[PDB]
Design a protein around this ligand. Structure first.
Ligand SMILES: *C1O[C@H](CO)[C@@H](O)[C@H](O)[C@H]1NC(C)=O
Ligand SMILES: *[C@@H]1O[C@H](CO)[C@@H](O)[C@H](O)[C@H]1NC(C)=O
Ligand SMILES: *[C@@H]1O[C@H](CO)[C@@H](O)[C@H](O)[C@H]1NC(C)=O
Ligand SMILES: *[C@@H]1O[C@H](CO)[C@@H](O)[C@H](O)[C@H]1NC(C)=O
Ligand SMILES: *[C@@H]1O[C@H](CO)[C@@H](O)[C@H](O)[C@H]1NC(C)=O
Ligand SMILES: *[C@@H]1O[C@H](CO)[C@@H](O)[C@H](O)[C@H]1NC(C)=O
Ligand SMILES: *[C@@H]1O[C@H](CO)[C@@H](O)[C@H](O)[C@H]1NC(C)=O
Ligand SMILES: *[C@@H]1O[C@H](CO)[C@@H](O)[C@H](O)[C@H]1NC(C)=O
Ligand SMILES: *[C@@H]1O[C@H](CO)[C@@H](O)[C@H](O)[C@H]1NC(C)=O
Ligand SMILES: *[C@@H]1O[C@H](CO)[C@@H](O)[C@H](O)[C@H]1NC(C)=O
Ligand SMILES: *[C@@H]1O[C@H](CO)[C@@H](O)[C@H](O)[C@H]1NC(C)=O
Ligand SMILES: *[C@H]1O[C@H](CO)[C@@H](O)[C@H](O)[C@H]1NC(C)=O
Lengths: 614, 47, 614, 47
């Protein structure tokens, strides 16, 4: 009915964001109303008497759950059902409750995780939790997988004494907290020998579906609390329904009506327009090195390459650059001839002034021109720093498309902040497929808010955050507005080349007031509001127009000779013909080109033999 | 007061700090900058 | 048992094969020891007495089961568990038991099909079985699927009475015969609500896996009696394990170790060499009209066409020709420009004398030349007839490969029988990927027993049935043997062009005795036992050889002039050069070509200006 | 004794026959020929 509410999730680990209040107030803004944490759940540095009641709505965490350095007394992760474990903390655990004690040895006391029943991947770790009560009685053998049971390290202590006892109804005295409600619900180690996975009870008539996470309301595939793999609407599938099925009888391939595409951990009817559609029937973010991206056909697909594929450049934060957090002087070597960035771009201040922790030298601003070959970026573009001696985002003047298959914090596909630039300068940017645009903290930016960003967007609800850019009427005071040859569409700068659409016409990459018809140095013509030069062999017409096309075929009068339909500079004299016979011509009265006599081998200055003397 | 190794470890004027409770090192980022090293400006708020 | 022994099955319907004994003998030869009937199970014209015990070993029939016109008293199809109904009898029934009575109104009496629990598709038809006992008490709502019970027409008439009753233990008096063993074993309408498919008992603890057909001996995926869809070794699968699985986390595709291929109704590790391997991970018999068959290092693969794909011609017996049983005057229009028959070819007698039953005029022998374009046949080639005036299988003069993805009777990929030809003439046949080759009953046919079939084959067990032809001693008597230039590999005829492999060398498509190196009009060179003519610009050496390659780069001496490495007929006079400057050259002493003076626009018959007079 | 319609319905010297029991027409193929119309030589047996 109501698709769960999702939050990105933090990834700071033991890092503290500002003062205890700051850190808390941020923890609140990220997980307020959240029901599904796509990333990590990191509750740290929460002090006494703070209200963590908003953490009751979290039902599932895809990454890991880190709870460390908290003096707060109670953490209400009660409605938490499952921890996927897509990532581990310290490369071993999907759940880490560490050093939660006060100076007076009195910190976290109650952790009512009475609904945490499944932990798909990773192990568990409890340590230095003096006030922790009841959790010491949890038979984790049910919650955790047996594959990780070995890597599990945890020991409790009761240096508080004020811990209560488990309600008798609690199985083997196992309970997360007080009351009969906080009894550990076992759905793993209490099942018939013929139970594939989890169950509701002990009787074999209570076996849950093979694709159920914690527990189930019924035996069937659609009676799951949480899917174990994918989610096909009502039901939990192991594999999204193939677009095509093999026909054992005809030994061929048939189309599957029940077919769905694979988007993350869900099965959809179609892929987001900004993603890549495979023949398999799954939405991916990039093709193998065996393919490129062929559009048309409606969507973005993957077709193989005629020979050696173009060089694919993994963006910052993926593959070879999973750890590198910004384009630095070290990893910049691998961005030489890139026309497409299959990932993200991070231009951080740490790259310019060098980083002594990752042992990388400062970046030479002259080396950012390397990116002038980059035509499109699949992920997002984050620019938190940029050379001061430069007044323009020059390196990306050829940037045409930002797909936004991945966004900063999962929201922004284009972020230009805290810069000394005077003008964006993205005169090639034609589409921002998805994600939001944020251009703020820019003192000297005056052309930002003039662009109609809605035109550039491609998905529903794409927002645009352009604030704190001194000069709405201050810029106009310094005469830093769009040129006179810039259509109301806006402009990426002052120069006529910095226009989105033109007022009248254009000379390639620049707008102009009128094409060079009648006069001018180069004769031109008009089509689609563009000025194209007439073939050099077009006589400069001081009266009317000069030509009606690019080729010498559309001239009103030739400048020299005329070889039939075409306007030539000099009549042919050695052009290959039929039967390997050369071709020689001559100019008569009206400068018309006519074939010479077959005999004339050294050409001819007149018709027939009477034209080529000896 | 972190080791000469973690010198310049916390970005955007974040301050390094030793967590003796866990025997680890972490950053105390300034308001507005997130990440394990305060490397990202929290775009989804102001400026 | 792991795998089962299979039989091709019959498809004669009500047709009688010879006399009652003949017929019975054919029935016996086919189904002896057979456990799985890939086609149909037609039991007809089985007289009194006659032992039908060999039927007891039949566990499953893919197509339909026909039991009609039998005076026999008992049919022991007891072990038959499932009828898939891949095909129907009379466009309705998967099982049709019809008019099984003697002239004295006493024939089929007992049909102990006590294990027949599943009928995947089709209805059931019982009619005119005066002696049939007990079967009238079976609840077919359990054996048949609800979708077809609307088409089920079956009434039993017991106007005799020699029948007994069902053991009191039998559920609702349902029995296929006497004894306690013939009690209908219901496993469909006795299942609890939680049951998805079949079941062992009524308790939910007995529910059969979703992918079970006739029931199970346990809940698990391996405890099935018969697979409902695919069979992956031990367990029954709905869909063979994909070669690659989608990664919900990285939004990309990962390789699947459990990955298998889809061959028929089984999950294999690799596809049969002769089959086509698709990207999906399934063995097929053809590529979509969107592509062709590109051999990829050792496995037939499907890619894509760079435009309008070559015409794919469906073979007789499939698609547009499912009804036609022989290429004839009518359907032959659709074989005009074929280079690859994607099916089978049936050249039958009826095609030549014309069929009145199918309203098709006699085939004009002159029109078999149409097939001279055919290059490969994905299936089998059957030729039971051929133009008498023709001595050769001319039409298939350029047939190179027979894949044998389908074989007649499931065994033979090439069958040339009962013909009148004197020579095969398949001088282009270089491969018979699979299937046996039978060439017999050809009165005056020679050379047949000379072919090294062991060279054309490409699969284990390929046999060759060549009997009752022209006597070998007679062939050598009338000097109708292999040409002297024919290697021991054999010969497709008397001519030097009919050799399988050449003795010495070969001129394109003909075997010879030696290349023309020292003499002969056109000079040639030897590489890979092939004779290729040197570039005409080579001078015929009356002493040593002439050249050592195709291009003029390998000439011992030029016949005319020489322009650097390459030997040319006449020095270049108009070739495009650098700076748009034309190129003119002149021959000197040793007929060597040199660049003229850049001034000479009309060329120069000599060096410098002193070579181009005026 | 089948109608003119099913005349030549059976190939290879087979004989058409009317099965009054089922009200159908079938073929009685000569030994060695299979198929509803006796159209196929039983290649897996004898020449
Ligand atoms: C182009 O500029 C001229 C200036 O005279 C103006 O009259 C005309 O309307 C303009 N054309 C446009 C805006 O399409
Ligand atoms: C939490 O959610 C409530 C309900 O929408 C909202 O009113 C409140 O402002 C939120 N708290 C925040 C954003 O800190
Ligand atoms: C197991 O635990 C150890 C603890 O040191 C950890 O390093 C490792 O990553 C874990 N998993 C494996 C597969 O070793
Ligand atoms: C620079 O790149 C290297 C790897 O290419 C990485 O280890 C390092 O962290 C990066 N530095 C920054 C500041 O991103
Ligand atoms: C059928 O096959 C078996 C195989 O062993 C053989 O013994 C038997 O003689 C054959 N014929 C009959 C009628 O069973
Ligand atoms: C079975 O009995 C019949 C009685 O008509 C007899 O003709 C036939 O020869 C017997 N069959 C065999 C295989 O002995
Ligand atoms: C039902 O029977 C008719 C023949 O009377 C057949 O043509 C039709 O295909 C059958 N329907 C189904 C669903 O099998
Ligand atoms: C057999 O079917 C009848 C209904 O036709 C039902 O009442 C009866 O309970 C069934 N017998 C058994 C043993 O379940
Ligand atoms: C000949 O071909 C036509 C068209 O495919 C078909 O209708 C006819 O039945 C065929 N005749 C024979 C004898 O196969
Ligand atoms: C069979 O082949 C021979 C080859 O000598 C030919 O002469 C004869 O005409 C053919 N038979 C018939 C009936 O055409
Ligand atoms: C074929 O070549 C071999 C080897 O050069 C030679 O000995 C033989 O005479 C040749 N055969 C004929 C028929 O000329
Ligand atoms: C077949 O012949 C026709 C007529 O010459 C020709 O147009 C066509 O291209 C040929 N087909 C192929 C596949 O070459």
């Amino acid at each position: 009915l109501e698709e769960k509410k999702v939050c990105q999730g933090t990834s700071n680990k033991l890092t503290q964001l500002g003062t205890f209040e700051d850190h808390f107030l941020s923890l609140q803004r990220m997980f307020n109303n959240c029901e599904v944490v796509l990333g990590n759940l990191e509750i740290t540095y929460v002090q006494r008497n703070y209200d963590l009641s908003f953490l009751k709505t979290i039902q599932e965490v895809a990454g890991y759950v880190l709870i460390a350095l908290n003096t707060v007394e109670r953490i209400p992760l009660e409605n938490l059902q499952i921890i996927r474990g897509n990532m581990y903390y310290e490369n071993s655990y999907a759940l880490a409750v560490l050093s939660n004690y006060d100076a007076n040895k009195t910190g976290l006391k109650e952790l009512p995780m009475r609904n945490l029943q499944e932990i798909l991947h990773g192990a568990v770790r409890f340590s230095n939790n003096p006030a922790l009560c009841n959790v010491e009685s949890i038979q984790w053998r049910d919650i955790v997988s047996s594959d990780f049971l070995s890597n599990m390290s945890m020991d409790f202590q009761n240096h508080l004494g004020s811990c209560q006892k488990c309600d008798p109804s609690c199985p083997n005295g196992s309970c997360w907290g007080a009351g009969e409600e906080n009894c550990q619900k076992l759905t793993k180690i209490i099942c018939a020998q013929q139970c594939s996975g989890r169950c509701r009870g002990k009787s074999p008539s209570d076996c849950c579906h093979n694709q159920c996470a914690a527990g189930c309301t019924g035996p069937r595939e659609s009676d799951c609390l949480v899917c174990r793999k994918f989610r096909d609407e009502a039901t939990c599938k192991d594999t999204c329904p193939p677009l095509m099925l093999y026909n054992p009888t005809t030994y061929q391939m048939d189309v599957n009506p029940e077919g769905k595409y694979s988007f993350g951990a869900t099965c959809v009817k179609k892929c987001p327009r900004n993603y890549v559609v495979t023949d398999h029937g799954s939405c991916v973010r990039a093709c193998g090195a065996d393919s490129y991206e062929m559009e048309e056909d409606g969507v973005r697909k993957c077709k193989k390459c005629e020979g050696p594929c173009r060089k694919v450049c993994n963006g910052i934060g993926i593959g070879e650059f999973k750890d590198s957090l910004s384009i630095n002087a070290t990893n910049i070597k691998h961005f030489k001839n890139c026309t497409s960035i299959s990932g993200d771009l991070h231009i951080l201040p740490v790259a310019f002034r060098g980083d002594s922790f990752t042992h990388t030298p400062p970046l030479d601003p002259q080396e950012l021109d390397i990116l002038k070959t980059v035509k499109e970026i699949t992920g997002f573009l984050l620019i938190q720093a940029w050379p001061e001696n430069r007044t323009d985002l020059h390196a990306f003047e050829n940037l045409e498309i930002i797909r936004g298959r991945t966004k900063q914090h999962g929201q922004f596909s284009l972020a230009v902040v805290s810069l000394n630039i005077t003008s964006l300068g993205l005169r090639s940017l034609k589409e921002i497929s998805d994600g939001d645009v944020i251009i703020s903290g820019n003192k000297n930016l005056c052309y930002a808010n003039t662009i109609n960003w809605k035109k550039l967007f491609g998905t529903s609800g794409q927002k645009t955050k352009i604030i704190s850019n001194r000069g709405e009427n201050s810029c106009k005071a310094t005469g830093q507005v769009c040129h006179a040859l810039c259509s109301p569409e806006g402009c990426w700068g002052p120069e006529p080349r910095d226009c989105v659409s033109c007022r009248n016409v254009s000379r390639g990459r620049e707008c102009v007031d009128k094409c060079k018809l009648l006069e001018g140095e180069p004769r031109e013509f008009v089509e689609n509001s563009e000025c194209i030069q007439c073939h050099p062999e077009c006589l400069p017409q001081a009266m009317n127009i000069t030509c009606t096309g690019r080729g010498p075929d559309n001239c009103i009068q030739c400048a020299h000779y005329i070889d039939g339909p075409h306007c030539v500079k000099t009549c042919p004299a050695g052009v290959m013909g039929e039967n390997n016979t050369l071709v020689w011509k001559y100019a008569d009265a009206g400068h018309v080109c006519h074939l010479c006599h077959p005999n004339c081998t050294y050409g001819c200055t007149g018709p027939g033999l009477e034209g080529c003397p000896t | 007061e972190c080791p000469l190794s973690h010198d310049g470890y916390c970005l955007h004027d974040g301050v390094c700090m030793y967590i003796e409770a866990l025997d680890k090192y972490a950053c105390n980022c300034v308001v507005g900058y997130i990440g394990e090293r305060c490397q990202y400006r929290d775009l989804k708020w102001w400026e």
